Amino acid sequence: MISLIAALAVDRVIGMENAMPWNLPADLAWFKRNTLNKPVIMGRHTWESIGRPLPGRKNIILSSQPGTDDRVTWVKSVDEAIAACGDVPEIMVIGGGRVYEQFLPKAQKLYLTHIDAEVEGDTHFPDYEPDDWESVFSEFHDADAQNSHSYCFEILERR
Ligand SMILES: NC(=O)c1ccc[n+]([C@@H]2O[C@H](COP(=O)([O-])OP(=O)(O)OC[C@H]3O[C@@H](n4cnc5c(N)ncnc54)[C@H](OP(=O)(O)O)[C@@H]3O)[C@@H](O)[C@H]2O)c1
Ligand SMILES: Nc1nc(=O)c2nc(CNc3ccc(C(=O)N[C@@H](CCC(=O)O)C(=O)O)cc3)cnc2[nH]1
Ligand SMILES: [Mn+2]
Ligand SMILES: [Mn+2]
Ligand SMILES: [Mn+2]
Ligand SMILES: [Mn+2]
Ligand SMILES: [Mn+2]
């Protein structure tokens, strides 16, 4: 199956000038927990934003142009990205905006972090149809000394 994982600020903002302005260690821990030992698919802009391979995961990069780093796998289409994952139980799509839009129709599961932060962004998570999805898990956290915003971890499964 195909899953998307993302962290959304107010109004579905996910990025700004190819960066994520906030700093929520608890959410990066959740990201690692839910992606470790799975293949991760990302667009080239997100690969540049991260800046290095994510350890313990097969890193698959979508780009129309030839790859520039053999520590990761480069593919030229959505179907090639899926095939390069091989036979695994769960494929994790980790963005960004343009990649989320292409894989959302194929996804069975969404791992969403809702961050109570106002951010002026240039990239958004796609505007999906709420009736298509059932919330099967939600866990709210107040801000603390390490995490400056409150946040909610939610998992949604396609009905
Ligand atoms: N908060 C979050 O959860 C989260 C997660 C991920 C990213 N982000 C943020 O999202 C932003 C980046 O998102 P973005 O929409 O600008 O870019 P993106 O989706 O990361 O990358 C888009 C690039 O991927 C390649 N691509 C996408 N689909 C393709 C296809 N079907 N075939 C071939 N190549 C394909 C193209 O590369 P080429 O131009 O080389 O062809 C395209 O320019 C950054 O701000 C990042 O920080 C946020
Ligand atoms: N929920 C969620 N939060 C995010 O921050 C996020 N970020 C991306 C894309 N950007 C990034 C940027 C950095 C790292 C990163 O450094 N991850 C480490 C953190 C480990 C830790 O802090 O415990 C990793 O090994 O995964 C991952 C993705 C995609 N989906 C997301 N999904
Ligand atoms: Mn507004
Ligand atoms: Mn296709
Ligand atoms: Mn197969
Ligand atoms: Mn806040
Ligand atoms: Mn749309």
Report the run of H or E that residue 79 belongs to, with start and end. Answer: helix 78-84
Q: Are 121 and 95 in contact (CB under 8 A)?
A: no
Specify binding-site residues for substrate.
Answer: 5, 27, 52, 57, 113
Q: Which of 5, 35, 63, 102 most suits a substitution to test ligand 1, by most atoms within 8 Å of the C-beta?
A: 63
- CATH code of the domain in which 64 resides: 3.40.430.10
Expressed as residue numbers, the domain containing 39 is 1-159
**Structural domain count, the chain:** 1
What is the Å distance from ligand 4's center to 120 Cα?
Answer: 32
Residue 58 near residue 85 (C-beta atoms within 8 A)? yes
β pairing state of 151-158 and 133-141: antiparallel
* Solved with: X-ray
* Burial classification of residue 74, based on how many CB atoms lie within 10 Å of its CB (0-12 exposed, 13-18 middle, 19 or more buried): buried
CB atoms within 10 A of CB 54: 17
